[PDB]
Amino acid sequence: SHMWIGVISLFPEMFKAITEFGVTGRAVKHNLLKVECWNPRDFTFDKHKTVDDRPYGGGPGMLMMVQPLRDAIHTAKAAAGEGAKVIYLSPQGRKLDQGGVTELAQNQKLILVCGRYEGIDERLIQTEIDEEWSIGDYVLTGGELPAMTLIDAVARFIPGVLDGLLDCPHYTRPEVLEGLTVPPVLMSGHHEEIRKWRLKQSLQRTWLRRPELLEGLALTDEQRKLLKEAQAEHNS
Amino acid sequence: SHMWIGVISLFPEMFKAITEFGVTGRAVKHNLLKVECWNPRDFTFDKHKTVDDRPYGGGPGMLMMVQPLRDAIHTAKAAAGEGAKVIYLSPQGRKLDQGGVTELAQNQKLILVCGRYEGIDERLIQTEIDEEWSIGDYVLTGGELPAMTLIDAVARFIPGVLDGLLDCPHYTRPEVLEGLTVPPVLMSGHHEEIRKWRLKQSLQRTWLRRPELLEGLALTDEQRKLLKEAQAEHNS
Ligand SMILES: CN1CCN(c2ccccc2CNc2ccc(C(N)=O)cn2)CC1
Ligand SMILES: CN1CCN(c2ccccc2CNc2ccc(C(N)=O)cn2)CC1
């Protein structure tokens, strides 16, 4: 299932970071992921290609100018055809988590609008945007890194591109590293013991680092047992 | 206060997205922010510049090879000199928020280690890493976008580069947009009424979208009043 993502950004060249490198770069080269960018600067008509404008009511900051942004969005929507969801990345949006990534990945077409300055006119959110999303409770200089982050996350769900708990520890060569050894179970070749060890480690690490994540899970019988074991060993 | 950030990454060219564009690009050109990258591939000695290795205990994935990564980290630490904090970006890390960004921004030097494949040997976390951080509860193909996100966030705190509530709505030209008008208060020129309107909007939007954020604040007398007003109007 091909995925198409339209991007609206004053800095389209930033997106080379995902389209030219790594797993996402491969997805693009192999036509599994298409990323198409429109720059509001290209939709300006004045001599200096003005893309910002003053906020009504005053204030220190600027907003994105409505007309070039609106025209870029409309062009992206035309190219997308039917069924594209338009996403605005902002701190006031729905907070992204893996469940949310899974939801967004169900779309074959997305348009991502990247805000700069103090953001965009509220009426454009009403008239052009379908959903607002945040990548976390922190503040950035633009919506491009959030857009790139979202693209990377949803790209993992495209066929051919590649449980709620934190990952277990992993080990590779050498057998001894600054005096630290590899857990003997991992060298035992006993697949079941190894699986159970990894699962128990994941449960232990989730409990110690992010206990609230556990509360949101319905643990299996096996997970309940291994978690109890890990907690017992912790209190020993 | 200059900030220096060392980066360890198999894809250093991704960081052009922050060093060549926008506010962070300006910070770099003006020597307010320095971003220096080391690529583990450059620290390999075999003919094919191998940077991955097999996990003990088996499994579908690979890990970053220890020796080239360790040598890159040591080189970065040497260049940083005294006082650099080494950060590993991973989903099992402390979840980043703006308070956390503020904490990390207090450092004049940071080294950011970007994991690929299934991540890095656990013993390297013990021996080389000071802190693990996550940019959110979702899964990406590498630590580069998280590293870039962190750089952008902390760069906003560097002098010369540029309250817990969501932002108010903002408006710019035109006065009427698809029939939608600008709130008359914003056209009134009454600075105090405008300030109070913006604050009330911020409180209202935070309450409606992210009520848990409010619980973590000690609201001022004025904020308590405007929030009560907004809630009263909502229930009217
Ligand atoms: C000082 N303000 C500048 C403009 N801004 C803003 C506002 C609206 C849209 C885009 C931006 C660009 N910034 C972003 C974007 C997303 C995130 C996220 N968490 O997903 C963090 N930051 C908010 C901050
Ligand atoms: C399937 N695994 C591949 C390897 N991995 C991993 C593990 C450890 C370090 C880096 C990575 C790179 N991925 C990241 C990194 C950070 C975040 C974040 N939320 O800050 C999300 N993803 C976890 C997922």
From Swiss-Prot, chains A, B:
Subcellular localization: Cytoplasm
The organism's place on the tree of life at top rank: Bacteria
EC number from the UniProt entry: 2.1.1.228
Protein name (database record): tRNA (guanine-N(1)-)-methyltransferase
Major subcellular location class: cytoplasm
Family in the record: Belongs to the RNA methyltransferase TrmD family.
Species in which this protein is naturally found: Haemophilus influenzae (strain ATCC 51907 / DSM 11121 / KW20 / Rd)
GO cellular component, one term: cytosol
One Gene Ontology term of the molecular function aspect: tRNA (guanine(37)-N1)-methyltransferase activity
Enzyme category, top tier: transferase
UniProt entry keywords in alphabetical sequence: Cytoplasm, Methyltransferase, S-adenosyl-L-methionine, Transferase, tRNA processing
InterPro entries (UniProt xref): Alpha/beta_knot_MTases, tRNA_m1G_MeTrfase_C_sf, tRNA_m1G_MeTrfase_TrmD, tRNA_m1G_MTases_N, tRNA_MeTrfase_TRMD/TRM10
